[PDB]
RNA sequence: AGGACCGAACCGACUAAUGUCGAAAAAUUAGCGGAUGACUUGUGGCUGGGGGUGAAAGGCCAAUCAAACCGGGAGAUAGCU
RNA sequence: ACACAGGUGGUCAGGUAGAGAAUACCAAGGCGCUUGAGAGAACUCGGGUGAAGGAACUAGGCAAAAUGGUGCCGUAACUUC
RNA sequence: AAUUCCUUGUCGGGUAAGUUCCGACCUGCACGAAUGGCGUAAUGAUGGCCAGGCUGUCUCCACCCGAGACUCAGUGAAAU
RNA sequence: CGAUGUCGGCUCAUCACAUCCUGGGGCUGAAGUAGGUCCCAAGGGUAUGGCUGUUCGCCAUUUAAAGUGGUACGCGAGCUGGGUUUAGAACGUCGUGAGACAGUUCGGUCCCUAUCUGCCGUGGGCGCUGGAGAACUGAGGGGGGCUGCUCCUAGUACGAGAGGACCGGAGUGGACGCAUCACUGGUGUUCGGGUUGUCAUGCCAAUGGCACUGCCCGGUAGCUAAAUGCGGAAGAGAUAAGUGCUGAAAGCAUCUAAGCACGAAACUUGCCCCGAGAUGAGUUCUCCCUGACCCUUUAAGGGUCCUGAAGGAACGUUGAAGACGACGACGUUGAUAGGCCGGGUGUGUAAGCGCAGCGAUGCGUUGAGCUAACCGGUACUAAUGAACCGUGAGGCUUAACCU
């Protein structure tokens, strides 16, 4: 459950550490983003030596949510924070080289193969 | 909408409601018959009759637990010594409500609640 | 095709071999006995009237007792009838079991929804509440405006306002049938159905095939 | 919030048509003492279902 | 109800070990990736147990590399295969929700040694 | 030592809600300012209407003030309703 | 104007905790405020709690929430020191 | 600018986005030196803006506790 | 002018079509994707933020689109009061001055208990004709009608290449609506526990009152969303723009004059709900009543005695029904409510005793004790025998069959 103005941590090592969600994509009047929905974010503070600077708008994908995800058998997965991965605004293509922390398997959409491969767990 | 809820409010807060049943439970045990409004009498069946059930078996823990309700040593003495043995073979239903017209002051439906005793 | 009358019995879930859990509503569909068969010659339309359950002998009135005795059917609670599809026929006194749902996949369940009593516009029509602060005075959940001005001069019919909510019959359609148990008279349908536990439900095959 | 014309006595009576009270007309006779009393209520003297219940 | 209770009873499993909140537990769960089925191990601390029969469930919290992960398992679901207990926490509270705030040396609990 | 600081009594009234045929012809509830001073208060005096008093708003002068109240000129006058 | 949630000067002023005439619970003493009984709808008023987000509300962080004590360490720009 | 119509002057800072705010220029319609000019620590229930924490303000409301509203008995208004 | 409250915002809308999207078409300087323009079409849908009081506008990022207008520039007896537009004060400017300025700043009381119409709900009365209890037909009315992306067709048709379809099928989303509590959660001042101050039960121990439920930690049932299922149709009928077949007037040609075809989210139906007060008051099934006297202004007349059935109402216990009425279950030939027994759930190892320790405290008895609304049982208490209302075969005329 990520909506506008929400703080997110960064799972990758692109140099960003905290980002603000400014829009939820994928539908008109969409309220909040799910486990693996694409969102538009702005970086609020990053590494000075990183390739992404403060106050830049680029897409992102949620990988972890505090609210959690629901499994088909009724189980749920919950995390202590919300995390995302950075993107390129033209092709999804996570720019990071490695991603820290667990990643749920809900991102297996025949496309996030790069995210799951770099995921230390699942 | 109070679907399947139980417990009358009686236009009182929780603390006042608890005390009022506590006193009026003690009065019923002491006198074995009292006159009250019908809604009050019905709600008392759920606080007085459990007390008699507790008094069926006499023990230190039961005596302490009984005392914590009604906060009266006279009532606790009355239980476990008379009410207990009298209802030993009785499987609930220790009370009886009898409607007795309407109160003159405000036309409250009044009723007598009295233990199934006093057949002397 | 005809439906059946059953009673809602709580809810449960079924665990499949692959792991997924299916929430199912349990409907108790005992034998339904046909009490009257209608024909175009007399009634102008063809239907079968069925009964289910049992009733106290001293509680059924004489007019109802005679109606059941004519068909030789034991008295039951209430009466319901279903129109025929012209492709099947029935006889008075015949008993209909839940087995007819063995070959179906979607069903429509009709029942009386739970009664919420007098409900406000916010709860009834999902009206948006006004601000709780910033000067608002006694207008936190009020409906707001209900008309325009002199030019209409009236409130249009069908306006959304507070009133009775629930306690009307509603139909949930295209529900997957999960399991049918003839000997135990159970019908497991995936999903939730209108009404509370113990309420009478009407189950018929889905019409939106 | 306030009337523009005073309603007539005809409208007043029409509104009041539903204010009429209803008699109990359901007075039962005690089995033993034969005293009229409200159904499911004790008699004035303290009888119910024949047996005396108040003893006062 | 009798009908419901009988319906749930046939779906039970009798190989559910007895565990209490605060007990370190490793739960084996089934994982499917297209056509291959594998066993995945989730080890953590039981912080809450919900007893409702066929609807009974428990939640396990584990400290991952950076943040904690809480998973709620349905006890009688086929997904869970086995439950094993390593430690026996000496807690005296039904729900250990206070462990979320705590971290580091303050998240450890004593041993029942019973 | 202090027109010093925090804070009750006491004095005042910055914000909000309630109340507007109110409990009340300006109040209540929760916060709020001063609180040894240019402070506050009891009792008794003095200043009287083109006048008083005013750390000055045209403020206050018996719930009435860009000229108080009462009686009189007076049945003022009204090309107006 | 009322048997009116307002106003009205002075004196005495105990116990436990507390710096305290604050505050909580009590003693002496005095009271339950002159309409009641039910039910437990919308909605209004006074309050309690709340998933994920955290000012995106709004003219405006209005209102709420939050901070809140004692001892020790430590404490910037500027300055009339 | 408590002063500026044209005007949201021009550039920069702050925001993803700033008719507000801060800094600089002067084309000062119509600043200006005791009806005082420019600075100024401290002070302010003073105006504007930003940040952290905090939250039902809000996305989007849900439940609950009390007093009314509703029914019964008694008394019994008002504007129009 | 003996008073029609004015700009924005919020809530709630409704209509027009000069259509923003979706739908159907003509032409194209239409290769395809993507366009331009015009015609038909109002079923549904038709943003979130920064700046400003702003509408507007600029800017940022979304969507299939972020349509134009009417409705007292819709809506203050529905809300706010930021702008404007009282009294205070200041700046610039004008005036000797009091003061003034669609010049600019700081501050500045928004009343109403609903009689009528209207609307949303819910009842009583009577009618529908002998009465009563049920189940229906359906005139008529309302609700719903939105759509993105991915894959297959296919990398096909097209095209020098770059690029890349039409038609049809499948899957998965957003927004909206209905239902529900099995799951994940919220609430749970009626359940259990921890703990601070103080008072009390003679005192210790153990408990209760008060301090916002004193402050907190969990939490049953209900209600509930963020939770979980389902829905938008397909099909048919008659059509709009448009495309036609045959075909004369007019030897030809021509969609039209006769005749025959197709043709859209529009219209009628199909889906869901209300519905015989549909005074045009409908249909079917079942049940109950078939005793006597008199009177007259001898009438579908009135009066008296005896009988009052089906059923209803009333009263009681009540409900996942409810403002009150109403609606549902039950009233002993009984599980309707309460209690009781067992279970479940929740909280979490009661009190007492014993042991270890100087003590706080710990261990054993003990996963104990206590448990609201839940589940299955049990007449233990309360649902009294009766009274009350409701009758006694149901008009006239005509038609058809028995007599």
Swiss-Prot record, chain A:
Keywords associated with the record: Ribonucleoprotein, Ribosomal protein, RNA-binding, rRNA-binding
UniProt GO BP: cytoplasmic translation
Alphabetized CDD domains for the sequence: Ribosomal_uL14 (cd00337)
SMART domains named in the record: Ribosomal_L14 (SM01374)
Statement: the UniProt record of this protein carries the keyword rRNA-binding: yes
Molecular function (Gene Ontology), one example: structural constituent of ribosome
Recorded consequence of changing residue 98 to A: Reduced RsfS binding
Superkingdom assignment: Bacteria
Effect of residue 114 to A: Reduced RsfS binding
One Pfam family per UniProt: Ribosomal_L14
Gene Ontology, cellular component aspect: cytoplasm; cytosol; cytosolic large ribosomal subunit
Entry-linked InterPro entries: Ribosomal_uL14 (IPR000218), Ribosomal_uL14_bac-type (IPR005745), Ribosomal_uL14_CS (IPR019972), Ribosomal_uL14_sf (IPR036853)
Xref: HAMAP family: Ribosomal_uL14
Subunit structure and binding partners: Part of the 50S ribosomal subunit. Forms a cluster with proteins L3 and L19. Forms two bridges to the 30S subunit in the 70S ribosome, contacting the 16S rRNA. In pre-50S ribosomal subunits interacts with RsfS, which may inhibit association with the 30S subunit.
Family from the record: Belongs to the universal ribosomal protein uL14 family.
Role noted for this protein: Binds to 23S rRNA. Forms part of two intersubunit bridges in the 70S ribosome.
Record's protein name: Large ribosomal subunit protein uL14
Organism: Escherichia coli (strain K12)
Classification lineage: Bacteria, Pseudomonadati, Pseudomonadota, Gammaproteobacteria, Enterobacterales
From Swiss-Prot, chain B:
Quaternary structure, from the entry: Part of the 50S ribosomal subunit. Contacts protein L32.
Recorded superkingdom: Bacteria
Role description: Requires L15 for assembly into the 50S subunit.
HAMAP family: Ribosomal_bL17
GO terms of biological process kind: cytoplasmic translation; ribosomal large subunit assembly
Family: Belongs to the bacterial ribosomal protein bL17 family.
UniProt-recorded name of the protein: Large ribosomal subunit protein bL17
Keyword Zinc: no
InterPro entries attached to this UniProt entry: Ribosomal_bL17, Ribosomal_bL17_CS, Ribosomal_bL17_sf
Keyword set, alphabetical order: Ribonucleoprotein, Ribosomal protein
Keyword Zinc recorded: no
Molecular-function annotations in GO: structural constituent of ribosome
The encoding gene: rplQ
A GO CC annotation given for this chain: cytosol
Curated annotation (Swiss-Prot), chain C:
Pfam families: Ribosomal_L3 (PF00297)
Protein name: Large ribosomal subunit protein uL3
Gene3D superfamilies according to UniProt: 3.30.160.810, Translation factors (2.40.30.10)
SUBUNIT field: Part of the 50S ribosomal subunit. Forms a cluster with proteins L14 and L19. In pull-down experiments interacts with CedA.
Keyword rRNA-binding part of the UniProt annotation: yes
GO molecular function: rRNA binding; structural constituent of ribosome
Protein task: One of two assembly initiator proteins, it binds directly near the 3'-end of the 23S rRNA, where it nucleates assembly of the 50S subunit.
Modified residues (N5-methylglutamine): 150
Protein species of origin: Escherichia coli (strain K12)
Record keyword Ribonucleoprotein present: yes
InterPro entries: Ribosomal_uL3, Ribosomal_uL3_bac/org-type, Ribosomal_uL3_CS, Transl_B-barrel_sf
Family matches, as HAMAP family: Ribosomal_uL3_B
Positions carrying N6-succinyllysine: 38
Alphabetical GO biological process terms: cytoplasmic translation; ribosomal large subunit assembly
Family stated for the protein in its record: Belongs to the universal ribosomal protein uL3 family.
From Swiss-Prot, chain D:
Gene Ontology cellular component list: cytoplasm; cytosol; cytosolic large ribosomal subunit
Keyword Transmembrane: no
Annotated signal sequence range: none
Region (Disordered): 1-37
Keyword Ribonucleoprotein attributed: yes
Keywords: Ribonucleoprotein, Ribosomal protein
Source species, domain of life: Bacteria
GO molecular function: structural constituent of ribosome
GO BP terms, alphabetized: cytoplasmic translation; response to radiation; response to reactive oxygen species; ribosomal large subunit assembly
Family recorded in the similarity comment: Belongs to the bacterial ribosomal protein bL32 family.
Subunit structure: Part of the 50S ribosomal subunit. Contacts L17.
Protein name listed in UniProt: Large ribosomal subunit protein bL32
Lineage: Bacteria, Pseudomonadati, Pseudomonadota, Gammaproteobacteria, Enterobacterales
